[PDB]
Amino acid sequence: SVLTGDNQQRGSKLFKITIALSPTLAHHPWPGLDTHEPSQSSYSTIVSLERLLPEMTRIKRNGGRILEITEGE
Amino acid sequence: IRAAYKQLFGNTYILESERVIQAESLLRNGSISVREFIRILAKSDLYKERFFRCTSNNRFIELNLKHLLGRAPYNQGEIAEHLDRYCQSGYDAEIDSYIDSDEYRRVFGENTVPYFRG
Amino acid sequence: MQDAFTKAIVAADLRGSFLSEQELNQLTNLVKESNKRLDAVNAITGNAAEIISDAAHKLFAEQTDLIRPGGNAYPNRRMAACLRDMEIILRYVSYALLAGDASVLEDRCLNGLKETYVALGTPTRSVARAVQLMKETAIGYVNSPSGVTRGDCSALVNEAATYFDKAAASIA
Amino acid sequence: MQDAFTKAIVAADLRGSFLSEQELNQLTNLVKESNKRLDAVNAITGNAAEIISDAAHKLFAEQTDLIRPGGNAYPNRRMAACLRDMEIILRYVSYALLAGDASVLEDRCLNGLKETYVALGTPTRSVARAVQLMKETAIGYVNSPSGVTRGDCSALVNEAATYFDKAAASIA
Amino acid sequence: MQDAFTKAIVAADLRGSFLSEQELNQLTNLVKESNKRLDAVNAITGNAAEIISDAAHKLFAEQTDLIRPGGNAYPNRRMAACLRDMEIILRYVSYALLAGDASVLEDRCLNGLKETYVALGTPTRSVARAVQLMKETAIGYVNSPSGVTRGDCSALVNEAATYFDKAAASIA
Amino acid sequence: MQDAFTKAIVAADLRGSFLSEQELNQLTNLVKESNKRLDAVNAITGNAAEIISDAAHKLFAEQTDLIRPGGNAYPNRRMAACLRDMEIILRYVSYALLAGDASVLEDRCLNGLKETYVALGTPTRSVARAVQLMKETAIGYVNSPSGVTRGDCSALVNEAATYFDKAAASIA
Amino acid sequence: MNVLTTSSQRGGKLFKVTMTLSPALSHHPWPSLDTYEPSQNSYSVVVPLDRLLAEMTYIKNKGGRVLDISPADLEALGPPDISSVAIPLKVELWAKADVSDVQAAIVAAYKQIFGNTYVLESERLTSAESLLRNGSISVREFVRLLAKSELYKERFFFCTSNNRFTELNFKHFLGRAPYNQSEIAAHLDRYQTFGYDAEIDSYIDSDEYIQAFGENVVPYYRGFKSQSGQTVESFNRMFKLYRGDAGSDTNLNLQGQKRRVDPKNLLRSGRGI
Amino acid sequence: MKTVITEVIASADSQGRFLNNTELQAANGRFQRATASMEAARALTSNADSLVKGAVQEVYNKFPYLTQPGQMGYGDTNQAKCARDISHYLRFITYSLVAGGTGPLDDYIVAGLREVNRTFNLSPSWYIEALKHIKGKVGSQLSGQPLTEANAYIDYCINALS
Amino acid sequence: MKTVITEVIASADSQGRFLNNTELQAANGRFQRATASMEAARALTSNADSLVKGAVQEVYNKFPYLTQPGQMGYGDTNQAKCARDISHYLRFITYSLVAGGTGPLDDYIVAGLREVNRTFNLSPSWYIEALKHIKGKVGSQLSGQPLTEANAYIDYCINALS
Ligand SMILES: *[C@H](C)[C@H]1/C(=C/c2[nH]c(/C=C3N=C(/C=C4\NC(=O)C(CC)=C4C)C(C)=C\3CCC(=O)O)c(CCC(=O)O)c2C)NC(=O)[C@@H]1C
Ligand SMILES: *[C@H](C)[C@H]1/C(=C/c2[nH]c(/C=C3N=C(/C=C4\NC(=O)C(CC)=C4C)C(C)=C\3CCC(=O)O)c(CCC(=O)O)c2C)NC(=O)[C@@H]1C
Ligand SMILES: *[C@H](C)[C@H]1/C(=C/c2[nH]c(/C=C3N=C(/C=C4\NC(=O)C(CC)=C4C)C(C)=C\3CCC(=O)O)c(CCC(=O)O)c2C)NC(=O)[C@@H]1C
Ligand SMILES: *[C@H](C)[C@H]1/C(=C/c2[nH]c(/C=C3N=C(/C=C4\NC(=O)C(CC)=C4C)C(C)=C\3CCC(=O)O)c(CCC(=O)O)c2C)NC(=O)[C@@H]1C
Ligand SMILES: *[C@H](C)[C@H]1/C(=C/c2[nH]c(/C=C3N=C(/C=C4\NC(=O)C(CC)=C4C)C(C)=C\3CCC(=O)O)c(CCC(=O)O)c2C)NC(=O)[C@@H]1C
Ligand SMILES: *[C@H](C)[C@H]1/C(=C/c2[nH]c(/C=C3N=C(/C=C4\NC(=O)C(CC)=C4C)C(C)=C\3CCC(=O)O)c(CCC(=O)O)c2C)NC(=O)[C@@H]1C
Ligand SMILES: *[C@H](C)[C@H]1/C(=C/c2[nH]c(/C=C3N=C(/C=C4\NC(=O)C(CC)=C4C)C(C)=C\3CCC(=O)O)c(CCC(=O)O)c2C)NC(=O)[C@@H]1C
Ligand SMILES: *[C@H](C)[C@H]1/C(=C/c2[nH]c(/C=C3N=C(/C=C4\NC(=O)C(CC)=C4C)C(C)=C\3CCC(=O)O)c(CCC(=O)O)c2C)NC(=O)[C@@H]1C
Ligand SMILES: *[C@H](C)[C@H]1/C(=C/c2[nH]c(/C=C3N=C(/C=C4\NC(=O)C(CC)=C4C)C(C)=C\3CCC(=O)O)c(CCC(=O)O)c2C)NC(=O)[C@@H]1C
Ligand SMILES: *[C@H](C)[C@H]1/C(=C/c2[nH]c(/C=C3N=C(/C=C4\NC(=O)C(CC)=C4C)C(C)=C\3CCC(=O)O)c(CCC(=O)O)c2C)NC(=O)[C@@H]1C
Ligand SMILES: *[C@H](C)[C@H]1/C(=C/c2[nH]c(/C=C3N=C(/C=C4\NC(=O)C(CC)=C4C)C(C)=C\3CCC(=O)O)c(CCC(=O)O)c2C)NC(=O)[C@@H]1C
Ligand SMILES: *[C@H](C)[C@H]1/C(=C/c2[nH]c(/C=C3N=C(/C=C4\NC(=O)C(CC)=C4C)C(C)=C\3CCC(=O)O)c(CCC(=O)O)c2C)NC(=O)[C@@H]1C
C-alpha cells in the first residue's frame, strides 16, 4: 500500500514493510476455513519505528514472513 | 399471616373470604415489607367497614393503638393528635402515621409482626 | 517533527557541541520577527475558506474539461475531494509557516502525494496549478491586511512563497 | 428481526403444529392489501424531510422555552440532536409499517430510549409531543396522495397511528 | 452525627492520642467566636420565611416556564413541594452553620437528593440556582443586622457561603 | 472539561446575558494572580518525586501493618500500585490548581475512586491519610521556594489545600 | 430487585429506594446486640411518591444512607433485547471497494468505535476517511486513527475514570466486556508509563482483535455470544455495559461517565493480582 | 470546552505526565494576551444593541426581497428572531474573547450549524453580512491588539458559516 | 520533538483544523518567554566547563568510596566518562532552554535512561548530585526569570532520574 502522505498522525521515521500473508492474519469473515485475500497475498504497510517492533513480532508468530523492509519515504 | 391477623384484628374470627389473598400473595414473592403487609391490612375495606364504622373515632384510635402497638394511650393529648388528623387528612394517612411512627419502627420495625408489648 | 529552533539544535548535537553564539543570533533575531510571523499566519487562517473558494473558481474557468463528464473533477463526489485536497495542502503550508520550516509540510503532507495522484489518474499538472492559484490569493491577504502596524513583511512573504512552491514541485 | 409472517410462524412453532387454516387467512388477506401498504410507506419516505420540518416548527411555536437559553433544544448542538432524533423515530415507524409489526420499532428504537432521555434530562413529555405532531402530519400525506388509485386506506392509517403511539407511550 | 468538636476528637482517637495542645487552641478560639457564630444563625432563623419567599420570586421571574403548564413547578401541588424543598435545604444549612461542620448537612440532607431530583425529572440546574438565590439573600441578613455589636463576621460569612455551595454542587 | 473562566461563561449563558461588569472584575483580578498561580504549580511539578517519596515513608512508619504480610501494601506488586496511585492523585491535583477549578480533578481522578478501593479491599481510610501527608509536604514547597519574588501566596495555598481535601473526602 | 406494580392503589408513581441498612432500622427480636440481617445489607423499599419524603428522612436520621432511588417504571423493565447483537452483522472492506462499500464501512466503524454516540459532520474525520478508499490504510489502521482522535479521548477517556475507560475501550475495540480485575489493572499500569497511545495500541495489537475481525473487518460485538477464555460473568457484564439500542456511552448525561460494571463483580470472576 | 488552559491540561493528561515548563509557557501566553482580549469584550458588550440594529438592517438592504410578504424577512416575528440570533453570535464572541479560546463559539454556535440552518432554510450568507457589517463598525471603536483579537474571532465564524 | 510550537501544530493537525487564535496565543507565550530562556542558555554555555569540574568533584566528596580501587569512580577512564556524561546533561539543558520545550531532553537523555543505567550499574543518585551542585552554582550567575527557567529544566531531569 503506497502511502498517500504520512499515514500516522503521531510522528517518527516511517518504514514500509511487505509481508506474505497467513489466512490467520487477515481471516475473511466466512463460514469454514478462513481464506486470506486473493489480490493481496503480500500486504504492504507503513509503520512508525516505535510500532515497528510490535508489528514485526505479531507478524512473526503468525505464519507470514517479511518479504522485504523499506523505509517509507 | 396467622399472627398478623390476630394482632391487628380484634382477635375476631377471620373467614377465608375475609382474608385478602393479594396481600398474602407477594409475601411469598417478596417486594412487600411486613410492615407494608400490615399496612395493606387496615387499608383493607374489611377493617374500615368493621372495627372502624361502628365504634367512635376515639374507640378505633385506642384500638389501633392497641392492635398496631401493645400500649394503651398514655395521655389525652396524643389521642387528640390523631383526632386532629381525622379531618386534617385522610384516614389512610393516620393509620399510615402509626406504622410510620418511630416506636413502631423502633421495636418490631421491619420484618416483624406487631405484639402487645403492653 | 521539526521546526526552525529544534532543527538548529539537532545540527549542533551531531557536532557534539553547545550552540555557537553566531547560531543563537539566528534564533534571537527569529524571535524578534515572531509578531510579524504570527500575523502572517493569522491572515491566512482568517481568510482560509475564501482563498480556496477563489482559487477553485479560477481553476475551473481555466480547465473547463475538469468539470465536464469524463473529466477528473466530475461528478460531485470527485469535485468534493478536489476541494478538500486543496484545503489540506493549504492547512499544512500554514503549519510550516508558523514552524519556520518546510519539514512538517514535506513529511506529513507532500510525501507520496504525487504517487497517489498518479495512481488515481488525477492530472498532477492541474493540481500544481491550483496550488499556485492559491499561493497568489493567499499572499494577497498576508500582504494587505487591516489594523496591523505598518512595516515590512517581505522576508516572511518570500518564505511563504517557497513553501507553496515546494508543494507545487513535489506534486508536479 | 420479526414481521407479521415470521411472527405467526413462531407462534405456530411453539404449539408444535402446522399453521392453522384460519391463521393462513390472516396472511392471505394481508398480502391482498400489500399494494396499499406499500404506497403508504412510499408516501412517508417521499415527504420525509417535510414531515419533520413541519412537526419541528409547530413543536417550537408551542414550547418556546426549549429554544431559549437553559432549555433542552438550545444551543445549536442540542437542537441538531433533537432534529436527528425525530427523524430516527420516523425512520423506524416506516420500517414497522412495511413489516406489519411493531417489533422492529420496539427493539431497535424504543428499547432503552426512555432511560437515555431521563439520564440526559431531556423532558420525555416534550419528546412524546413531537412524536404525535409528526404522526398527524404523516397521516396527512399517507391519506391524501396524488396519482394513486382511489380506495380505502383506513385499516393501514390506524395501524400507522398505533405505531406512532407505541413510540409516544414508551418514550413518555 | 458530628460537629467541629466531635470531629477533632474522632481524628485524635484514631491516632490513639490525647488532643494536641495546638489542636485545643483551634477549639479554644472557636469557642471565643461562638457569640458571633450564634447571632449569624439567629439572623437566618429570624428571617427564614422571607429568605425563601424572596428567592422564589426571583427564581420564577427568571425561569418563567417552571410555572407554565408542562413545567416542573406546575401545578399547585408541585409548586408546594418545590417551596418546601428550598426551605428544608435552608433548615439544614442553618444546622451546619451552628455545628461548625458540613457533615450534618451532607448526611441528612444532600445525600441522595440529586438522585431523587433525577428520578422525578426535576431539572437539577434550576434547583441549584434557587440554592444560590437563597444564599445571597441570607448573607444579606447575616451581614446587616440590627442591635448587634459592630465587628467582623467575614470568617463566618464565608463558611456560610461554603455550606450553601456544597449544597448547590451536590444537587447540581 | 471546565476551568475558572469557562465556568463563569457557562453561568452567564443560562441567564442568557452578556457578562456582568462585576463578573469581568473577578476574571480581571484572576488574571493578575496568574504569575503567582503558575509558580505554585511549577513548585509542585518540580518536587513531585520527592513529595511522594516523603509522604510514603511517613505513611508506612505510621501504619506498619500495610507493609506486613497480609497487609494491603505487601508484597512488592501491591506496594508499587500504592505508590503509583499516590502519584496519580497528585498529578490531577496539580492540573486542577492550574485550571483554577476542582472539576478536572473530580471527573477523571476522584469519581468512583472510593468504590474501586472498596471492591479491592484497599482500606479507604489509609488512602485518605496518604493524601493529607502529601498535602502538607506539597504546601511546604509551594510556600517556601527559592529565587521567586517574595509576596503573599496564601490565597493560592488555601485553594491548593481544598483540592487535596476534596480528594481526601471523596476517597474516604 | 424486580418491582411488581408500577403504580399504587390510589394513583402514585412508585419508586424503588435502596439504602444500606442499619441495626436501628431493622433488628432481630433476640437478646444481645441488635443486628440487621446480613442478606439485607443493601435493602430495597418500594414507596409511593407521597411517603418518599418521610420514608427517606427516617432512613437518614438513622445510620442509613441512600444508595440510590430509581423510578419503578424504568426499573422492572425487561433486560435489553440482544436481537441486533446476538448476531452482529459484520462488515468487510474488500480491496477495490466501490464508493458505496467504503461508505458503509465508515458508518459501521463510527457506530461501534464510538458507541451509539452521534458524530457530527464537523466531528467526522475527512483525512482518515480519505486514505481508506485509495488504499494505503487497513480498516484496522482506520480503527487506530479513530481511537487516537481527540473525539474519542474527549468522550471516553478525558471525562470518566481510567477504570471506566478500560471497559469502555474493551467494548468498542472488542465486542467483549472485561473479564477479571487483572485486565483493568494491566491497562492502568500500561497507561502510567507508556501513556495513552500505547494503551490504545495494545487493544488493536492484541491477538484477540486479530483472531476475530483481524484486518479490514470493522469490529462487531463478540459479547452476547460464547467466546474462548471468557468467564460466564463477563456475559452478564455485557448486559451492564450495553443497555438497549439507542443507548450510548455519553459524557453528556448527568454524572455522565460512571461504571457500568461494579468492581466487586470483576473480583468475583477472578482475583489474584 | 477548548481554551488554551484546558488543552495543555488535556495534552499533559493524555501522555500521563506532569505539567512541565512546556505547557506553562503556553498558559503564560494566554494570560498576557487576556488584557487586550478583555478590553475588546468591554467595548463590544457596551455597543451591543447598536451593532445589532445596524447589522439586521444591513442584511435587509443587501437582500431587499426578504422584507417582501411571503418571504422569511417579512413579519415581525421573523425580524425579532433575526435580531435575537445576531445578539447570540455577538454574545458568544465576547465569551470567547474572555475565555481565551474558540471553545465557547464551537460548542454553542458552530457544532451542528449546518443542519440547523438546512432544516430551517436559513441562508448562511445572511449571517455573514451581519458579521461583516459588524466587523466594519468594530473597526472604529477598537484599535491595535484589542481590535486584532476582535477580528480573529468574528472571522472564525465567517469561516465556520461559509 | 516536543516544543510549544510543535505541540499546537500536532493538536491542530489531529483535529484536522487550521491554526486558529487559540493556538497562536500559546505560541506567543513561548516567544515572549524566549528572551529570558535565551539569556540563561548564554550564561550556562559560557561557564560550562567550570560547572562540570565542580560537579564531578562534588560527587566524589559526596561518595568518597567511588575513588577507591575496584570501584567505578576509580581510574581515569571512568573519571573522563563521568565528565563527558555531565557535559552532555548540561549541553542538552541549554538546547531545551533555546528550543522552548523539554523535547531535546526527553529524546536524548530521558528515553531509555533506566535501562542504560541498569546495564552499566550507574546509580542515578550520582548524576543527581552533579545536577544539584550545578543548580546551586547557577543560582549565582543568574537571577529573576532567566534563573527560574534554568531551574525548571535542571529539575525536570532530577525528577526523570529519580
Ligand atoms: C482445488 C481444486 C485445488 C487447490 C485448492 C487449494 N487452495 C488452498 C489454499 C488457498 N487457496 C486460496 C484461494 C483463494 N484465495 C481467495 O482469496 C479466494 C477467493 C477470492 C480463493 C478461492 C487461498 C487464498 C488459499 C490460502 C489460504 C487457505 O487456507 O485457503 C489449498 C491449501 C494450501 C495449503 O498449503 O494450505 C488448496 C489445496 N489446490 C490443489 O491442490 C487443488 C488442485
Ligand atoms: C483538485 C484540485 C484536483 C484533484 C483532486 C482529487 N483528489 C482525488 C483523490 C485524492 N486526493 C487525495 C489527497 C490527499 N492525499 C493525502 O495524503 C492528503 C493529505 C493527508 C490529501 C489531501 C487522496 C488521498 C485521494 C484519494 C481518495 C479521495 O477520496 O480523495 C481525486 C479523485 C480521484 C479518485 O478517483 O479517487 C481528485 C479529483 N484532481 C483533479 O482532477 C483536480 C485538478
Ligand atoms: C506582515 C505580513 C504585515 C504586518 C505585520 C506586523 N505585525 C507587527 C506586530 C505585531 N503583530 C502582532 C500579532 C500577534 N501577536 C500575537 O501574539 C498574535 C497571536 C494572538 C498575533 C496575531 C503583535 C502582538 C505585534 C506586536 C504589536 C503590534 O501589533 O504592533 C508588526 C510590527 C513590527 C513587529 O515585528 O512587531 C508588523 C509589521 N504589518 C505589515 O505592514 C504587513 C502587511
Ligand atoms: C428532541 C425530540 C428532544 C431532545 C432530544 C435529545 N436527545 C439527545 C441525545 C441523545 N438522544 C439519543 C437518542 C437516540 N440515539 C439512538 O441511536 C436512537 C435510536 C437508535 C435515538 C433516538 C441518544 C443516544 C443521545 C445521546 C447522544 C447525543 O447526545 O447525541 C440530546 C442531547 C443531550 C444534551 O443534553 O446535550 C437531546 C437534546 N431534547 C429536547 O430538548 C427535545 C424535546
Ligand atoms: C392508501 C394509503 C392510498 C392509496 C393507495 C392505493 N394503491 C393502490 C394500488 C396500487 N398501488 C401500487 C403501488 C405500488 N406497488 C408496488 O409494487 C410499489 C413499489 C414498487 C408501489 C409504490 C400498485 C402497483 C397498485 C396496483 C395498481 C394500481 O395502482 O391500481 C390502491 C388500490 C387498491 C389495490 O391495489 O388493492 C390504493 C387504494 N390510494 C388511496 O386512495 C389512499 C389515499
Ligand atoms: C424546587 C426548588 C424545585 C423542585 C423540587 C421538587 N421536589 C419534588 C419532589 C421531591 N423532592 C424531594 C425532596 C427531598 N427529598 C429528600 O430526601 C430531601 C432532604 C430531606 C429533599 C430536599 C423528594 C424526596 C421528593 C419526592 C417526594 C415529595 O413529596 O417531595 C418535586 C415534585 C416531584 C413530582 O414529580 O411531583 C419538585 C417539583 N422542582 C421544581 O420544579 C423546582 C426547580
Ligand atoms: C456577625 C454576623 C454580626 C455581628 C455579631 C456580633 N455578635 C457579638 C456578640 C454577641 N452576640 C451574642 C448573641 C448570642 N449569644 C447567645 O448566646 C445567643 C443565643 C441566646 C445569641 C443570639 C452574644 C451573647 C454576644 C456577646 C455580647 C454582645 O451581644 O455583644 C459581637 C461582638 C464580638 C463578639 O465576638 O462577642 C458581634 C460583632 N456583628 C457584626 O458586625 C456582624 C454583622
Ligand atoms: C496507597 C496509598 C494505598 C493503596 C493503594 C492501592 N491501589 C491498588 C489498586 C488499584 N488502584 C487503583 C486506582 C486508580 N485507578 C485510577 O485510574 C485512579 C485515579 C482515578 C486510581 C487512584 C486501581 C484501578 C487499582 C486496581 C488495579 C491495579 O492494581 O492497578 C492496590 C493494589 C491492591 C490490589 O490487589 O489490586 C493498592 C495497594 N493500598 C495501600 O495499602 C495503601 C493504603
Ligand atoms: C507563591 C507560591 C510564590 C511567589 C510567587 C510570585 N511570583 C511573582 C511573579 C512572577 N512569577 C513568575 C513566574 C512565571 N511566569 C510565567 O510565565 C511562568 C511560566 C514559564 C512562570 C513560572 C513571573 C514571570 C513573574 C513576574 C516577575 C517576577 O518573577 O516577579 C510574584 C510577584 C508578585 C506578582 O506577580 O504580582 C510572586 C509573589 N512569591 C511567594 O511569596 C512564593 C515564593
Ligand atoms: C469478629 C471475629 C470480627 C468482626 C466482626 C464484626 N462484625 C461487626 C458487625 C456486624 N457483623 C454482622 C454480622 C451479623 N449480623 C447478623 O445478624 C448475623 C448472622 C445472622 C451476622 C453473622 C452485622 C450485621 C454487623 C453490623 C451490625 C451489627 O453489629 O449487628 C463488627 C462491628 C461493625 C460495627 O460498626 O458495628 C465487627 C467488629 N470484626 C472484627 O473486628 C473481627 C475480625
Ligand atoms: C436573520 C439574519 C434572518 C432570520 C433568521 C431566522 N432564524 C430562524 C430560526 C432559527 N434560526 C436559528 C439560529 C439559531 N438559533 C439558536 O439557538 C442558535 C445558536 C445560539 C442559532 C444560530 C435556529 C436554531 C432556528 C430554528 C428554531 C428557532 O425558532 O430559532 C427563523 C424562523 C424560521 C422558522 O421558524 O422556521 C428566522 C426567520 N430572520 C430574518 O428575517 C432573516 C432572513
Ligand atoms: C560519573 C557520575 C560516573 C562515571 C561515568 C561513567 N559512565 C560510564 C558509562 C556510560 N556513561 C554513559 C552515559 C551517557 N552516554 C551517552 O551517550 C549519554 C546520553 C547523551 C549519556 C549520559 C553511557 C551510555 C555509558 C554506558 C557504556 C559506555 O559509556 O560505553 C562509565 C563506565 C561504566 C562501565 O561499567 O562501563 C563510567 C565510569 N564515572 C564514575 O566514576 C562515576 C560512576
What CA–CA distances, in Å, run from G189 to G192, G200, H16? 5, 13, 11
What CA–CA distances, in Å, run from E69 to D125, E66, H25? 12, 8, 54
Q: Is the CB of A4 under 6 A from ligand 2?
A: yes
Q: How far is the CA of E170 from the centre of ligand 6 (A)?
A: 15
Residues G158, H17: C-beta atoms closer than 8 Å: no
Q: What chains are in contact with H, requiring at least 3 Cβ pairs below 8 Å?
A: C, D, F, G, I
Q: Which three cell numbers stand for residue C83?
A: 476541494
Which one of G141, G203, G206 would you mutate to disrupt binding with A, by most A Cβ within 10 Å of its Cβ?
G141
Residues H162, C49: C-beta atoms closer than 8 Å: yes
**Kind of pairing, strands G42-47 and A66-71?**
unpaired
Task: Give the burial class of F149: count Cβ atoms within 10 A of its Cβ; 0-12 exposed, 13-18 middle, 19 or more buried.
Answer: exposed
Helix (H) or strand (E) holding G43: strand G42-47
Helical residues (DSSP H) of chain I, grouped into ranges: 4-15, 21-62, 76-99, 103-105, 113-120, 124-141, 144-161
Q: Among all chains, which residue has been given the C-alpha cell 448525561?
A: G253
DSSP state of G179: -
What span, in angstroms and rounded, lies between the C-alpha atoms of C149 and H145?
Answer: 10
Edge-to-edge strand ranges of the sheet holding A66-71: A42-48, A14-20, A66-71
Residues G120, D116: C-beta atoms closer than 8 Å: no
E49's CB contacts (< 8 A; 6+ apart) are none
Q: Which three cell numbers stand for residue B25?
A: 400473595
What span, in angstroms and rounded, lies between the C-alpha atoms of H65 and H74?
Answer: 9
DSSP state of G149: S
Distance of CA C100 to the CA centre of its chain: 12
Helix (H) or strand (E) holding A71: strand A66-71
What span, in angstroms and rounded, lies between the C-alpha atoms of D65 and D74?
Answer: 9
DSSP state of G16: E
Least Cα distance to C130 among C159, C164, C153, C98 occurs for: C164
Distance of CA G125 to the CA centre of its chain: 25
Q: Does G95 touch chain A (CB under 8 A)?
A: yes
Q: How far is the CA of D108 from the centre of ligand 4 (A)?
A: 15
G157: amino acid identity, one letter:
F
Q: How far is the CA of G259 from the centre of ligand 4 (A)?
A: 21
Residues in chain E: 172
Long-range contacts of C59-64 (CB under 8 A, 24+ apart): C59/C126, C59/C129, C59/C130, C59/C133, C62/C129, C63/C126, C63/C129
For chain E, percent helix, then strand, then coil, each to nearest 5? 80, 0, 20
Contact status, residue G206 vs residue G140, Cβ threshold 8 Å: no
- Which CATH number is F1-172 given? 1.10.490.20
**Kind of pairing, strands A42-48 and G42-47?**
unpaired
Q: Facing residues of G15 across strands?
A: G47, G71
What span, in angstroms and rounded, lies between the C-alpha atoms of C136 and C138?
Answer: 5
Q: Among all chains, which residue has been given the C-alpha cell 529570558?
A: I36
Cβ under 8 Å to G: I residues 7-46: 11, 14-16
E69 backbone dihedrals φ, ψ, rounded to 5°: -55, 135
What span, in angstroms and rounded, lies between the C-alpha atoms of B8 and G163?
Answer: 52
Edge-to-edge strand ranges of the sheet holding G66-71: G42-47, G15-20, G66-71
Backbone dihedral region of B26: left (phi > 0), alpha (psi from -120 to 50 degrees) or beta?
left
Query: Does D37 carry a binding-site annotation?
Result: no
Q: Does E62 touch chain F (CB under 8 A)?
A: yes
Resolution (A): 3.8
Q: Provide the Cα torsion H59, H65, H67, H72; round to 10°.
A: -90
What span, in angstroms and rounded, lies between the C-alpha atoms of D30 and D19?
Answer: 16
G45 backbone dihedrals φ, ψ, rounded to 5°: -115, 145
DSSP state of A9: S
What span, in angstroms and rounded, lies between the C-alpha atoms of F78 and F66?
Answer: 10
Residues I30, H26: C-beta atoms closer than 8 Å: yes
Class of domain H1-162: mainly alpha
Residue nearest (by alpha carbon) to ligand 9 atom 6: F36
Asked whether F and A share 3 or more beta-carbon pairs under 8 angstroms, the answer is no
Least Cα distance to D44 among D136, D135, D141, D109 occurs for: D141
Mutual angle of helices G181-194 and G162-173, in 10-degree steps: 100
What span, in angstroms and rounded, lies between the C-alpha atoms of B8 and B31?
Answer: 21
Does the N-terminal peptide bond of residue F75 adopt cis geometry, omega within 30 degrees of 0? yes
Least Cα distance to F40 among F165, F167, F162, F154 occurs for: F154
Q: Among all chains, which residue has been given the C-alpha cell 502529601?
A: F134
B52's CB contacts (< 8 A; 6+ apart) are B60, B91
F104: amino acid identity, one letter:
V
Q: Which three cell numbers stand for residue F131?
A: 493524601
Residue nearest (by alpha carbon) to ligand 10 atom 22: G38
**Kind of pairing, strands A14-20 and A66-71?**
antiparallel
Q: How many CB atoms lie under 10 A from the CB of residue E144?
A: 9
Q: Facing residues of A14 across strands?
A: A48
What span, in angstroms and rounded, lies between the C-alpha atoms of H63 and H87?
Answer: 20
Q: Among all chains, which residue has been given the C-alpha cell 463598525?
A: H137
DSSP state of G219: -
Chain I residues in contact with G148 (beta carbon < 8 A)? 14
Q: Which of D52, D75, D83 sits opposite H108 (nearest CB)?
A: D75
User: Which atom of ligand 12 is found nearest the CA of I74?
Assistant: 41
Q: How many CB atoms lie under 10 A from the CB of residue C39?
A: 20
Q: How many CB atoms lie under 10 A from the CB of residue I14?
A: 18
DSSP state of G217: B
CA atoms within 13 A on the CB side of G177: 25
CA atoms within 13 A on the CB side of F129: 18
Contact status, residue I4 vs residue I29, Cβ threshold 8 Å: yes
Q: Among all chains, which residue has been given the C-alpha cell 392453522?
A: D20
Q: Is the CB of A25 under 6 A from ligand 1?
A: no
Method used experimentally: cryo-EM
Residues F77, G273: C-beta atoms closer than 8 Å: yes
What span, in angstroms and rounded, lies between the C-alpha atoms of C149 and E28?
Answer: 64
Q: Does I94 touch chain C (CB under 8 A)?
A: yes
Q: Does C6 touch chain I (CB under 8 A)?
A: yes
What span, in angstroms and rounded, lies between the C-alpha atoms of A69 and A15?
Answer: 7
Helix (H) or strand (E) holding F89: helix F76-99
A47's CB contacts (< 8 A; 6+ apart) are A8, A14, A15, A16, A17, A55, A72
What span, in angstroms and rounded, lies between the C-alpha atoms of G193 and F87?
Answer: 12
C155: amino acid identity, one letter:
A
Contact status, residue I124 vs residue I25, Cβ threshold 8 Å: no
Contact status, residue D43 vs residue D37, Cβ threshold 8 Å: no
For chain C, which residues make up each domain, given as ranges?
A: 1-172
Contact status, residue C153 vs residue C36, Cβ threshold 8 Å: yes
Q: How far is the CA of H29 from the centre of ligand 9 (A)?
A: 15
**Probe residue for ligand 10, chosen from G27, G35, G43, G65 as the CB with the greatest number of ligand atoms within 8 Å:** G35
Q: How far is C69 from chain I (nearest CA, A)?
A: 31
G76's CB contacts (< 8 A; 6+ apart) are G2, G3, G4, G6
Backbone dihedral region of F16: left (phi > 0), alpha (psi from -120 to 50 degrees) or beta?
left
What span, in angstroms and rounded, lies between the C-alpha atoms of H41 and H52?
Answer: 15
Q: How far is the CA of F122 from the centre of ligand 10 (A)?
A: 19
Q: Among all chains, which residue has been given the C-alpha cell 442499619?
A: G22
Using the CB atoms, write b or e for I69-102: b if 16+ within 10 Å. Answer: eeebbeeeeebeebeebbbebbbbbbbbbbbbbb
Contact status, residue H117 vs residue H127, Cβ threshold 8 Å: no
Q: Which three cell numbers stand for residue D80?
A: 441538531
B107 backbone dihedrals φ, ψ, rounded to 5°: -120, 130
For chain H, which residues make up each domain, given as ranges?
A: 1-162
DSSP state of F67: G
